[PDB]
Design an enzyme around this catalytic site. Sequence first.
Site, mmCIF file in Angstrom:
data_model
loop_
_atom_site.group_PDB
_atom_site.id
_atom_site.type_symbol
_atom_site.label_atom_id
_atom_site.label_comp_id
_atom_site.label_asym_id
_atom_site.label_seq_id
_atom_site.Cartn_x
_atom_site.Cartn_y
_atom_site.Cartn_z
ATOM 1 N N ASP B 70 26.286 28.155 39.679
ATOM 2 C CA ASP B 70 27.093 29.023 40.536
ATOM 3 C C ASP B 70 26.768 28.926 42.023
ATOM 4 O O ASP B 70 27.667 28.833 42.854
ATOM 5 C CB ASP B 70 26.980 30.481 40.080
ATOM 6 C CG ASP B 70 27.620 30.721 38.726
ATOM 7 O OD1 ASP B 70 28.867 30.764 38.658
ATOM 8 O OD2 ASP B 70 26.878 30.875 37.735
ATOM 9 N N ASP B 213 34.816 45.072 36.009
ATOM 10 C CA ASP B 213 33.622 45.799 35.605
ATOM 11 C C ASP B 213 32.891 44.878 34.647
ATOM 12 O O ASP B 213 33.412 44.560 33.588
ATOM 13 C CB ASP B 213 34.010 47.112 34.916
ATOM 14 C CG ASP B 213 32.823 47.826 34.291
ATOM 15 O OD1 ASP B 213 31.941 47.149 33.718
ATOM 16 O OD2 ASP B 213 32.776 49.072 34.372
ATOM 17 N N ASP B 243 40.723 43.013 30.783
ATOM 18 C CA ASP B 243 39.552 42.185 31.050
ATOM 19 C C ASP B 243 39.337 41.227 29.884
ATOM 20 O O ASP B 243 40.005 41.328 28.854
ATOM 21 C CB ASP B 243 38.305 43.048 31.254
ATOM 22 C CG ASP B 243 37.251 42.366 32.125
ATOM 23 O OD1 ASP B 243 37.377 41.154 32.406
ATOM 24 O OD2 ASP B 243 36.288 43.045 32.535
ATOM 25 N N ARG B 289 38.275 32.526 27.646
ATOM 26 C CA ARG B 289 39.077 32.270 28.834
ATOM 27 C C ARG B 289 40.138 31.204 28.572
ATOM 28 O O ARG B 289 40.177 30.165 29.235
ATOM 29 C CB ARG B 289 38.180 31.883 30.009
ATOM 30 C CG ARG B 289 37.288 33.019 30.458
ATOM 31 C CD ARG B 289 36.319 32.602 31.540
ATOM 32 N NE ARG B 289 35.562 33.752 32.022
ATOM 33 C CZ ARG B 289 34.662 33.705 32.997
ATOM 34 N NH1 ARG B 289 34.387 32.554 33.599
ATOM 35 N NH2 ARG B 289 34.032 34.811 33.368
HETATM 36 C C1 LIG Z 1 26.250 37.340 40.192
HETATM 37 C C2 LIG Z 1 27.395 38.190 39.726
HETATM 38 C C3 LIG Z 1 28.741 37.536 39.598
HETATM 39 C C4 LIG Z 1 29.825 38.472 39.144
HETATM 40 C C5 LIG Z 1 29.801 38.925 37.721
HETATM 41 O O1 LIG Z 1 28.714 36.323 38.897
HETATM 42 C C6 LIG Z 1 29.832 35.492 38.908
HETATM 43 C C7 LIG Z 1 30.688 35.347 37.613
HETATM 44 C C8 LIG Z 1 31.183 33.922 37.229
HETATM 45 C C9 LIG Z 1 32.057 33.736 36.023
HETATM 46 O O2 LIG Z 1 32.071 34.692 35.023
HETATM 47 O O3 LIG Z 1 32.750 32.736 35.920
HETATM 48 C C10 LIG Z 1 30.982 32.778 38.251
HETATM 49 C C11 LIG Z 1 30.838 33.185 39.695
HETATM 50 N N1 LIG Z 1 31.045 32.193 40.724
HETATM 51 C C12 LIG Z 1 29.962 34.404 39.999
HETATM 52 N N2 LIG Z 1 29.625 34.738 41.368
HETATM 53 C C13 LIG Z 1 28.437 34.204 41.965
HETATM 54 C C14 LIG Z 1 28.088 34.548 43.383
HETATM 55 O O4 LIG Z 1 27.711 33.467 41.321
HETATM 56 CA CA LIG Z 2 34.064 43.838 31.313
#
Ligand SMILES: CCC(CC)O[C@@H]1C=C(C(=O)O)C[C@H](N)[C@H]1NC(C)=O
Ligand SMILES: [Ca+2]
Lengths: 388, 388, 388, 388
Positions: B70, B213, B243, B289
């Site tokens: 990420d 959430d 969600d 997804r």
């Molecule tokens: C660190 C929390 C955050 C929100 C749930 O995570 C994410 C979810 C992700 C996801 O479920 O695909 C990927 C993201 N690119 C991400 N944001 C960051 C900055 O890494």
């Molecule tokens: Ca949720």
Amino acid sequence: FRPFKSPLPLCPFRGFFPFHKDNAIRLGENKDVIVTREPYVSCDNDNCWSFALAQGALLGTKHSNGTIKDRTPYRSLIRFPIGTAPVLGNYKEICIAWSSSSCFDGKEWMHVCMTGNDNDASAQIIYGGRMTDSIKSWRKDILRTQESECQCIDGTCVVAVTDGPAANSADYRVYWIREGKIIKYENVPKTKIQHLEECSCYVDIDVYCICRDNWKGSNRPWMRINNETILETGYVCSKFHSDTPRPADPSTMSCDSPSNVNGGPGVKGFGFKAGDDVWLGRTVSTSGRSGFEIIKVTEGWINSPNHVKSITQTLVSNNDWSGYSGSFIVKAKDCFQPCFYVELIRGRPNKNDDVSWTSNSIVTFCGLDNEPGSGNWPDGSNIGFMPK
Amino acid sequence: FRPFKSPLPLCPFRGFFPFHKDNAIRLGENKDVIVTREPYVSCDNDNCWSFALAQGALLGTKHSNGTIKDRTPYRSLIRFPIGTAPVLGNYKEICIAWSSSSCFDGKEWMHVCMTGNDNDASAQIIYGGRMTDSIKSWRKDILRTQESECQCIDGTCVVAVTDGPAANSADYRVYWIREGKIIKYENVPKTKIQHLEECSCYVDIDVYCICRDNWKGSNRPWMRINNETILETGYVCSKFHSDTPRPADPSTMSCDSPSNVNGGPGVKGFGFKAGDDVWLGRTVSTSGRSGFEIIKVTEGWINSPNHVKSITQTLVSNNDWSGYSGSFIVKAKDCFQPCFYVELIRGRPNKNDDVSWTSNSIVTFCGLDNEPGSGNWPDGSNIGFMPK
Amino acid sequence: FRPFKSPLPLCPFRGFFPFHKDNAIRLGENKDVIVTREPYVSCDNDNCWSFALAQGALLGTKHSNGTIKDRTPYRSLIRFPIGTAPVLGNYKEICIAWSSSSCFDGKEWMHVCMTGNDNDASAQIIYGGRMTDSIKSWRKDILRTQESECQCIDGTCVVAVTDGPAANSADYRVYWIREGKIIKYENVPKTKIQHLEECSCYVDIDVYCICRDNWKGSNRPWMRINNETILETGYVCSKFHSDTPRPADPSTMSCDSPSNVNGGPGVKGFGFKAGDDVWLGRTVSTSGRSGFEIIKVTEGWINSPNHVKSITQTLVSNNDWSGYSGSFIVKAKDCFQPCFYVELIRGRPNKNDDVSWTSNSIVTFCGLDNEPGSGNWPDGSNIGFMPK
Amino acid sequence: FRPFKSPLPLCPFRGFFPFHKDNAIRLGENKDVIVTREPYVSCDNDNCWSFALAQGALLGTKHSNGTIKDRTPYRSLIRFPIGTAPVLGNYKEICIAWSSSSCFDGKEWMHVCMTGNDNDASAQIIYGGRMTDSIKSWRKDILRTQESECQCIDGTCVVAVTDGPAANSADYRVYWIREGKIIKYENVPKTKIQHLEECSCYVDIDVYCICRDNWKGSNRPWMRINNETILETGYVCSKFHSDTPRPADPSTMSCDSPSNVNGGPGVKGFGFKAGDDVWLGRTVSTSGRSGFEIIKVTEGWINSPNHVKSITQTLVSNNDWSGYSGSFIVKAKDCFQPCFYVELIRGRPNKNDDVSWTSNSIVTFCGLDNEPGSGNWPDGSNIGFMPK
Ligand SMILES: CCC(CC)O[C@@H]1C=C(C(=O)O)C[C@H](N)[C@H]1NC(C)=O
Ligand SMILES: [Ca+2]
Ligand SMILES: *[C@@H]1O[C@H](CO[C@@H]2O[C@@H](C)[C@@H](O)[C@@H](O)[C@@H]2O)[C@@H](O[C@@H]2O[C@H](CO)[C@@H](O)[C@H](O)[C@H]2NC(C)=O)[C@H](O)[C@H]1NC(C)=O
Ligand SMILES: *[C@@H]1O[C@H](CO[C@@H]2O[C@@H](C)[C@@H](O)[C@@H](O)[C@@H]2O)[C@@H](O[C@@H]2O[C@H](CO)[C@@H](O)[C@H](O)[C@H]2NC(C)=O)[C@H](O)[C@H]1NC(C)=O
Ligand SMILES: *[C@@H]1O[C@H](CO[C@@H]2O[C@@H](C)[C@@H](O)[C@@H](O)[C@@H]2O)[C@@H](O[C@@H]2O[C@H](CO)[C@@H](O)[C@H](O)[C@H]2NC(C)=O)[C@H](O)[C@H]1NC(C)=O
Ligand SMILES: *[C@@H]1O[C@H](CO[C@@H]2O[C@@H](C)[C@@H](O)[C@@H](O)[C@@H]2O)[C@@H](O[C@@H]2O[C@H](CO)[C@@H](O)[C@H](O)[C@H]2NC(C)=O)[C@H](O)[C@H]1NC(C)=O
Ligand SMILES: *[C@@H]1O[C@H](CO[C@@H]2O[C@@H](C)[C@@H](O)[C@@H](O)[C@@H]2O)[C@@H](O)[C@H](O)[C@H]1NC(C)=O
Ligand SMILES: *[C@@H]1O[C@H](CO[C@@H]2O[C@@H](C)[C@@H](O)[C@@H](O)[C@@H]2O)[C@@H](O)[C@H](O)[C@H]1NC(C)=O
Ligand SMILES: *[C@@H]1O[C@H](CO[C@@H]2O[C@@H](C)[C@@H](O)[C@@H](O)[C@@H]2O)[C@@H](O)[C@H](O)[C@H]1NC(C)=O
Ligand SMILES: *[C@@H]1O[C@H](CO[C@@H]2O[C@@H](C)[C@@H](O)[C@@H](O)[C@@H]2O)[C@@H](O)[C@H](O)[C@H]1NC(C)=O
Ligand SMILES: CCC(CC)O[C@@H]1C=C(C(=O)O)C[C@H](N)[C@H]1NC(C)=O
Ligand SMILES: CCC(CC)O[C@@H]1C=C(C(=O)O)C[C@H](N)[C@H]1NC(C)=O
Ligand SMILES: CCC(CC)O[C@@H]1C=C(C(=O)O)C[C@H](N)[C@H]1NC(C)=O
Ligand SMILES: [Ca+2]
Ligand SMILES: [Ca+2]
Ligand SMILES: [Ca+2]
Ligand SMILES: [Ca+2]
């Protein structure tokens, strides 16, 4: 500030001259070029642009295999500098579409983009980059449109649309759209026209459309339209027909109905009325999509016993593949200059084009009131050189 | 001269129509396309743009191996023509960022860009190309933001920001920024909202944000904000949750708190309030997804026993991979047109996507007050064709 | 109409924040990126741009083999979007040059481009795209200049130039140029400065240049200049030196002469005077071009016994390669925002970079009056992945 | 609003300085660059542009094999940023052409484009992107033109055109064109000039053209033209000849006729009259297209016994391949700055260039009233590195 394009007359002309040529297939040998088909040209105040239906794949890659297929979700109307090949570095994606039309109204661009299931397609109206309206398929049978530029007069754009069978009686409409909002439509009268596809249109005071009858007519159906209604319809009188396939010259003088000879299928083409005369583009072959010529028929627009091919310009040899062709105009002070593009189709299903993909290059010509020379401007690719 | 964007109401609409689609993965087969994720769309006065978090590597190269990760220093918020694939020839690097938001205020672009160590990140505020302010991590736990467009009213832009645990109680703030300078912030009230991530926002007089959430809610938390303060909060009442993961329909009507069922983790999504009704995007699968649909729930915005899915548009089949989605608006005279993008994630960790990289393509839709047709617009890549 | 840039004071700041980063080497794995070195940044009214000395070859091709060589006829000053990699599709060739400076005067761009034989080079002055003047080598020993942006005040641009030995007494001049025409020059006083190369300059009412002494000084020589003359010179007082190589902290407080310790060679660097304090960029290593940090030295601009490193921001780890660095400014209403770029050199002669080429990527930071977080933003390339 | 370019005098100058250089062949090693020849430069109000005749193929691909051939339908006049290599991502296709001229009149661009069969070619006149007129071949023998920029004064552009044998008596005309419409033409008087090809022109109050006699003259024929008529003709008096092939220095002073020694064939070149003196570009070799120098001949414009080469600038070594060269001007307040480009031809038929293709790179120089240094700026490609 820019005023809306006006209902200007067509400029005088007596021949057609080489304009832009992209050599897109030749240039696509190293897999840089986007797979396309159904290309066309349209111009705004500052530039003329190449448009085309992309296939969402680069020419010569594995995803280009089988792009002969007409309608997929991965096709988009794309736009690129006129005469350049479409590459990732220079293209703009206009809208999702497996059928399209584009025209500039003097102030902003309008696009008509068909996509979705064959039995439930919709057309998106784009104006100044914003989706402003839509058309829902009413015959539920491949809602589709021109594959070349529409025309706009005093702010109102006109576009021809078809929904129904490709080889039988269908529905044909004209839509009037102003600043992206559908004002009205009319069902095209079937008093003369029996089948209508892929209209090639231009302005000569009023909008003239010369189209493709895919059913019974080897002659081409036509419409004359203003900013309010359809004024006139018919088929091109010229006993020298201009669809493909078609009968050998001379054939029937059919001003008011399809010829009923070599009627199906057909190819998108164009023409220009000039007084009582008519200029007609066509493939050199009467059966296949090879070669390209444009003929001027004396009195070919009217019911007359005096039809004669006074001119024949051979622009692509019959030894070379052609394809679709269509009209576009360029403003010239107080008249519109008539021009046209020719689609040069390479790959499937062309005989001896041993590649798995289907694509095209582009060549264009414009009319001038001067005497032309002669030459040959085919695609130019050695298909043996290409990634398959 | 251009005035600041105004607090216009949301335009009427009754369906969503295919807009732009980039086919970026298909087009990336020959290693031309930049690896990305967390894409979105935002528009200025002249164009709509695709934005995304790049991975500082080209798709299919050795540097693309392992881009599922990420946060790295090699990620930048990049911008490219809407509906085109991001290539070195057409992209613009906006800022260094592994989390971002962008919005145009009528005159200039603002960007929010998070980068740096997880425990000491900072957000850079960019305005008209200049770095004008910053936010220093205050919980020291992955300071992060929307991953979609912010909103600006009368010169003041609003953006939601989170710092804290991803699966536990965290801190959520809204920042007001005017011409690049932070005016104030507010801690989001936890009277209803218990967890908030990746807000998808739009304007309907006031700014509405529908978020994610990631902890206890399979329903989506929401905020209503003006240019001065947070006016209202809650969760979407719709007993049909939006969600992923989430319970099967129908679930609980939870207007005021998280559902507490299938609460974690989640996916970035969006919605549009329409009177007392609500439109909600979601994956077709309740667990994964895959697929994408948008439903309209009658009275789904309010506490009512009459919730019913009056409409369901299936835009990506459940046989195809989806991902993030988010709202964006396009000015339409005296109202804002609601639109949305869907991220189509390919590669790791998707089952049977046998490549080492992680990336995405983009598809978009806009709302019109017309009846839509139907179709399917998935990524479209044969992953077997791709460089691994 | 645009007025000439004014003599604005430097904005207040207390830290530096990540701005743009190009990841050019990572992105060059598939041979799309132009080989470069001596990069920098400069901004006009609408955009900030990356500039660099190209090597007339693509990274990873056979022509890139041996690009460690400093001066060839095949080097050009090129310009590309800030934070993007330089590719054939997005670059602009500014002039033929193996040494350059660029600055925008509010209305047009000026460039200084050195090329030709080492013993008979000339500098071309480009203004608004036109070659308007020249400088002929007067010491006939590698006429050369800043390798970073010059500065312009009220229409008059200032640029530092050197002709002579690189490791001995040489000639150093400042040229004043207005609308591309050389107005005058001055020989830099040698009352304090004994060697001067690659000046990094900015505006704080007057033009301040902090440069590279390649001979006897591990401390950096500096100049203060207005639109008419050189006002002041010296070396940075800070007993914490900022050249490479240099002595360990703390070293000598040498306000008025070179340190005479670890004096040669050196590296292009920068600094910002802030009241009586000074911010200094430097490699983390005292001997090699690895890592990058910026320190604030309390009272480091003046003769004082109270020098202390009040701040140290580590922006590139000592485990990663750095290179040149330099100042640039961005107008911020009524002050200039101080920023800087860092050159991240990959390839020869770096230990364990087993490739035949020499090139670089770029990372940039800007100053704000806020507290920064922390992180690490190195080149990021796995050199083992690269075409050699 | 912009006024038409005026009949300004030529600026003072005493030497030529390195300007832009593209290194197109070096940069084309990975098959990104378009095959070209007959390049030139021309400038509008905002930019100078590289123009060239493309071959409709990428350098190093199979379609580039055999591009030594002069005239095909797949050649287009293309335009690209000055000093950059021509790639699919940055080029613009101007018109279909195997011979061309371009010039900006202060308001819009004009282009002259010859294409078609050798015995029936036509020239298209493009103005502001629109095809506005044409010239039909009247000798039916390869209608052709300058291969460098034309000149426009007070709205009327002037261009030299040839139709007839390349090594015998032919027809030479000048056409006056205003806003794209041919106003008139004149047959060039044969009282002095016996053969005329590929005129290199510039403005010094009136239009001066220095051309190529491909038949009997090792000296260069010249014309002086205003916006209405041909005012004067002759051959350059300089007993130091400037065509290739040519006699060793010194040769005959032939102001009024071809030298009749080493008369055929020839190469496109240029010159600048300066008072009674003349500057002449030429290959270093008297027999081959290798090296490039420019000489100033004292009193070389007039009938005098005092001719002497007062200056010789060697810009490309005789160990390196050159090719065509031509003049272009850049407006400089109240005079025109004289500049020139040199074509650096690589591939067939050059000895030891073992590739199947034929192409070129570009280097340019401008005149200043300063003393120049010295250097060498050849193509720079290792032909052994190139795809064949
Ligand atoms: C660190 C929390 C955050 C929100 C749930 O995570 C994410 C979810 C992700 C996801 O479920 O695909 C990927 C993201 N690119 C991400 N944001 C960051 C900055 O890494
Ligand atoms: Ca949720
Ligand atoms: C173009 O594609 C065809 C068909 O590809 C097959 O089916 C596709 C949908 C996809 O799933 C591919 O992976 C499949 O290979 C190719 O024709 C096949 O070629 C293979 C190998 O020679 C042969 O064994 C199969 O029988 C063929 N399949 C069919 C249905 O004909 C063809 O090779 C491709 N052409 C090129 C130039 O790559
Ligand atoms: C994607 O990369 C993995 C891991 O790469 C290894 O570690 C990286 C950080 C880098 O240093 C590489 O040089 C290393 O190879 C690859 O998985 C490895 O594959 C090799 C060869 O088959 C195997 O011997 C190792 O055990 C694997 N390492 C691990 C940690 O799994 C993988 O092959 C790459 N995928 C692709 C498509 O290239
Ligand atoms: C980088 O180039 C060197 C040197 O290239 C040689 O000299 C150049 C000027 C050019 O003319 C080339 O054709 C020559 O090969 C390469 O080093 C050579 O490698 C060969 C083959 O292994 C070896 O036999 C020679 O002794 C080497 N020559 C020298 C002077 O060291 C080197 O291989 C190149 N590196 C890469 C990654 O391609
Ligand atoms: C450049 O092309 C020549 C000629 O190509 C041949 O004719 C062309 C018109 C085209 O149809 C090609 O397919 C033909 O190959 C190549 O010369 C040929 O090389 C082959 C194989 O070595 C040889 O058998 C033929 O005799 C040659 N033909 C001729 C007429 O000379 C040449 O190889 C090409 N050069 C490169 C670098 O690819
Ligand atoms: C349609 O456009 C009209 C243009 O003026 C004239 O009338 C039309 C019918 C054509 O004959 C055209 O050539 C003429 O110049 C407008 O008068 C009229 O308001 C327009 N109507 C609509 C529906 O916009
Ligand atoms: C905030 O914006 C206000 C806009 O006018 C109106 O008041 C706000 C609160 C909203 O209800 C909006 O829809 C209304 O149109 C300005 O009056 C006010 O000055 C602004 N305040 C700040 C802090 O800029
Ligand atoms: C130089 O610029 C001057 C600018 O005004 C002031 O004076 C100079 C010396 C600086 O102190 C600057 O900060 C001040 O604002 C002009 O007065 C002067 O005309 C200029 N001279 C030249 C040679 O152009
Ligand atoms: C041609 O241009 C003329 C320009 O004015 C002057 O006269 C010409 C002949 C040149 O000597 C020029 O240098 C002078 O400045 C116009 O007077 C004339 O109207 C123009 N004629 C045409 C055909 O456009
Ligand atoms: C479905 C009818 C229609 C007109 C005859 O078919 C077409 C003819 C084609 C052709 O003869 O080449 C290909 C077209 N791209 C097409 N239009 C669509 C939407 O598929
Ligand atoms: C010739 C003196 C000069 C300054 C010390 O050398 C440089 C230092 C260099 C360096 O230490 O990296 C590389 C440079 N590109 C260079 N400038 C030129 C024109 O070659
Ligand atoms: C046909 C006569 C003409 C002038 C001598 O030949 C040329 C000379 C050439 C040359 O000596 O390099 C190549 C040219 N591209 C050409 N022009 C055309 C149209 O082919
Ligand atoms: Ca038919
Ligand atoms: Ca030193
Ligand atoms: Ca490539
Ligand atoms: Ca000759």
